[PDB]
């Protein structure tokens, strides 16, 4: 009889353990490039001396040896360079074979076939399929990350933290990356077979999948539904009918499964952190060390001049003209890999942004941008350096505009307000890791200014009154809003100040929603005198126009005869009433755990359409939806439900409580699941 295979033992558990891919909730053979794995092949007879076995691995619709999307290698003994198979042992008709791949092989789904040369003939049989990923553990892989703890956080961690809020109140929200959840890896892999690049030229796309730079840039495009049937549809209007309020999501899992389940129809809706969380999931799943970055006072320069304009009218009203040019915060991602296209000094963290802000080559994609390069102002390098630099270090110009006259007049220039408290989750904990120093030289330093000029060069070759807005008291949705405008006269004369104020509800990006309060006043001040003008906004006044951001823009334009206007600005954040999660017993893997949701209604009216959304990788499969009954005025809701832990360690439980009066109240609970 001719030499032939009877069966193959992929030793899946063993290889996956060795290749750090055992966390994926999948039964497939998942491997990482540049690392070898062992298989056992039972032949029908012994391997003859004059016989030969040749392995054939191939990926994509056009497997080409030239493009490295197809490799044919013989069962040798001397481990070869790229793909190779070594016969480490023969027992009976069983061949113990060690197969290795190149650290440069394209990532994705491969199929393996065997060609046998026996008794003068040739026979072929398919052995099976496997998934090959980037290998952050391999010193020669470009995504290599040497530090154990860092690699664990940036690749293996599925529970995360994303900072939000404002420069006045930095907050955080939990996020379930869930890269290990059922079918997630599969979906993230399918994204590459659905991009514009892949449809344009499938043969070249698949070949380029050996480049984290390429893969990274594609994902920045494919995570938003713009141009290519991507995953998320952005919406910063404060009205999300036809979908879900961006603030209600708790992770990337429900989003990716919804995308697939709907025939790849846009998931409605998302905002920057939603795009970044979802991107972070794809990146970690594929093996590219990744993390989420939050830039407060993020500028959106729309004409590459490193400058952004914001306008107000003499009555203190923020004009749409630029109300969103400087977001309270903007969230993006960083990918870790070397930049062979830029040089040794630019390797490391690379900015990637899936939020559709600026088009790049006609498509909404952004990055990779070397963080190091951004700090030095080398915005001539790929990709999208100019835009990102502006996001973190653009100058802010305030303008006064009177539509009635057509007149426009510059009020002031601030070179240090853009790009502050750039944060990311600390490794192994929830602490805030500030990385501003990584994106720019110290504000107020000559370097900072020297770099600015350098970057701008590559793109294009006294007041007597001081004001300040302080928050008086507690700010919570349900309570009246109390502020005070503090004004002081630094001149030697007695000044009379005319003050025009407004309060608008906004979306964190700056999108103006509705005016909820306005007022004018004139106060006389003697030299060095300090006065306070109270600003009181009732719940009734803002409740109808306040969105899930729970933000309000407060402005006061003040002026004294013969002096330029003084503009005082302050965005405030109202806290949602507290939502609480409690475990009623010790948490052990595979053992039922009793949990409790607690919420008290602070309003004098009842809350209806109450829905609880709970999820957490390793704590429960998918998302749990509970319909809680109407909660009367000042009453408490106590919801019970059990979770069933599947993986030990530190897990993150997340919940979203939504009702007619309070959309997207959030909760998070750390739970140590024991074995
Ligand atoms: Ca897109
Ligand atoms: Ca600056
Ligand atoms: Cl999967
Ligand atoms: Mg501009």
UniProtKB/Swiss-Prot annotation:
Q: Which domain of life is it from?
A: Eukaryota
- List residues binding Ca(2+) 1: 221, 224, 226-227, 229
Q: Which co-factors does it depend on? A: Ca(2+)
Which InterPro entries does the record cross-reference, listed alphabetically? Ig-like_fold (IPR013783), Ig_E-set (IPR014756), Papain-like_cys_pep_sf (IPR038765), Transglutaminase (IPR050779), Transglutaminase-like (IPR002931), Transglutaminase-like_sf (IPR036985), Transglutaminase_animal (IPR023608), Transglutaminase_AS (IPR013808)
Record PTM Phosphothreonine, positions in chain: 111
Identify the EC number(s): 2.3.2.13
Q: Which SUPFAM superfamilies match?
A: Cysteine proteinases, E set domains, Transglutaminase, two C-terminal domains
State where Ca(2+) 2 binds.
301, 303, 305, 307, 324
The Swiss-Prot or TrEMBL record describes its family as follows:
Belongs to the transglutaminase superfamily. Transglutaminase family.
Indicate what this protein is called per its UniProt record: Protein-glutamine gamma-glutamyltransferase E
Task: Provide the organism lineage as a comma list.
Answer: Eukaryota, Metazoa, Chordata, Craniata, Vertebrata
